């Protein structure tokens, strides 16, 4: 159920055996927006996936994959670049070869950047900028962390890196010591042998070095005419089961489909503004940091302000003592969410962090949920409220509150 790490021929491997008819192959390269030299280099390097290699052209890579009936996908986060390809289990060797060729020899033709790669990045950046909530969350991330993981993931409208910079970054990043291989087919030994045989020609460089994360605080404001948002942010140390339990105790999302909820945030909203503003919370683990955020949205700024004050009071109320039933409910919900975040074969923000970390990412993490006690949650909350939080306000700025008025 959980990936088991292994190392063959200097290649990091992590396999999983499932009873299905399909499979998956991915490479998790530590070359995300955290390590980029300039702005937007990681995005363009990721967009260069499955382009004209030294042995094949883009036409071949696309048309012949279509003939074989397979899907090729790419992904970019603030800390990773993921190249994946799902297929029927009968075509493992071909896709292993394709991924190895893409990683190793992916000759960067100067006229492809100005014809196929850059417009796609522009369109993706525009689509991201249209989404208000994603922009607000990115601004909160940038305000909380200084520059380590607080960079800008997508390409800004006023940047244009040369092909030489991308080629240099690719030559410095695509090395045998800077990624791993994730497979979840019905056979593991065969996939392991294939990956060991094929991913052994890339030169063995050295992992990229980045400074430890620097944590601070700050508040940003912006104007909008549509719906209004007010997001809180509490930077936290490396993720622990207590943090997941706290995030599930805060709650915000209903269990039953058409209902309100009995979590602290739901009750705060109900007793504050008669369910005219919704508050949800979630946790985003990282390599050496975490961010717990509370998002309050609605159309009435007065209701948003009132429910924000009520939710802050409710969160502050957790530092004294917690009844056992609340802890049990939070533990159950957190365990359910954490285990349900593993079913898809696509690597989300939770599974990738567990896989990259080699210190019992999932095998012992689940066992640590049942040992959470109210004292531990109280201590975590008390340590969380020492430094001030970071807020982002979107909409009418004369009613949306500051942090000092919460």
């Amino acid at each position: 159920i959980s990936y088991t790490p292994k190392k063959v021929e200097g290649v990091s491997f992590a396999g999983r055996e499932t009873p299905t008819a399909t499979g998956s192959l991915s490479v998790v390269i530590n070359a995300g927006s955290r390590y980029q030299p300039d702005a937007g280099v990681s995005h363009l390097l990721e967009k260069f996936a499955f382009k004209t290699t030294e042995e094949r052209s883009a036409l071949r890579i696309t048309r012949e994959s279509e003939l074989l009936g397979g899907q090729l996908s790419t992904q970019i986060t603030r800390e990773h670049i993921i190249l994946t390809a799902r297929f029927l289990n009968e075509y493992l060797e071909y896709y292993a070869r394709l991924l190895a060729e893409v990683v190793d020899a992916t000759k960067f033709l100067p006229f492809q950047l100005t014809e196929e790669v850059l417009p796609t990045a522009r369109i993706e950046s525009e689509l991201f900028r249209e989404d208000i909530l994603r922009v607000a969350m990115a601004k909160l991330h940038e305000k909380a962390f200084h520059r380590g993981i607080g960079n800008e993931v997508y390409l800004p409208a006023s940047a244009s890196p040369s092909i030489s910079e991308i080629k240099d970054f690719a030559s410095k990043a695509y090395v045998k010591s800077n990624f791993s291989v994730i497979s979840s087919g019905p056979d593991v030994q065969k996939a392991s042998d294939l990956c060991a045989k094929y991913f052994a020609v890339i030169p063995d460089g050295s992992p990229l070095k980045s400074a430890p994360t620097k944590i601070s605080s700050g508040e940003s404001r912006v104007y909008s005419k549509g719906t209004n948002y007010f997001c809180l942010g509490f930077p936290a140390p490396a993720a622990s089961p207590e943090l997941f339990v706290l995030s599930s105790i805060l709650g915000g999302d209903a269990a039953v489909k058409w209902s309100h909820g009995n979590t602290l945030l739901a009750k705060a909203a109900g007793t504050a503004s008669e369910y005219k503003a919704t508050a949800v919370a979630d946790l985003t683990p990282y390599s050496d940091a975490s961010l717990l955020s509370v998002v309050i949205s609605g159309s009435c700024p007065k209701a948003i302000k009132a429910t924000a004050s009520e939710s802050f009071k409710a969160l502050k109320s957790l530092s004294s003592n917690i009844p056992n039933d609340v802890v049990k409910s939070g533990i159950a919900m957190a365990k359910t969410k954490y285990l349900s975040a593993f079913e898809p074969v696509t690597l989300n923000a939770i599974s990738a962090s567990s896989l990259v970390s080699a210190s019992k990412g999932s095998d012992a993490f689940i066992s640590g949920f049942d040992k959470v006690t109210p004292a531990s949650i109280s201590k975590v909350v008390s340590s969380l409220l020492a430094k001030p939080a970071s807020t982002v306000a979107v909409g009418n700025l004369d009613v949306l509150p500051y942090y000092d008025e919460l």
Partner: protein, 77 residues
């Protein structure tokens, strides 16, 4: 020695510009029908010409009676 070695069932046939024997074999009935229609139209647009009338239309039975002259001794001066 094969286009798409993993799938040897495929092959590439001679072609000029999307002109392939497989497509060429398909359009033959259309060409034949168009030729027949053109021939029929040319026939129908020229059926009062004296040479055609006396050579092709007249000898055919059950149709030559209508396509024959019916002038008695009162004829060309």
């Amino acid at each position: 020695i094969s286009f798409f070695p993993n799938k040897p069932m495929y092959h590439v046939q001679p072609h000029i510009s999307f002109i392939t024997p497989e497509r060429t074999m398909k359009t033959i009935p259309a060409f034949s029908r168009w030729a027949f229609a053109a021939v029929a139209g040319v026939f129908v647009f020229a059926m009062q010409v004296p040479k055609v009338k006396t050579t092709i239309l007249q000898p055919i039975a059950f149709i030559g009676d209508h396509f024959k002259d019916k002038t008695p001794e009162e004829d060309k001066w």
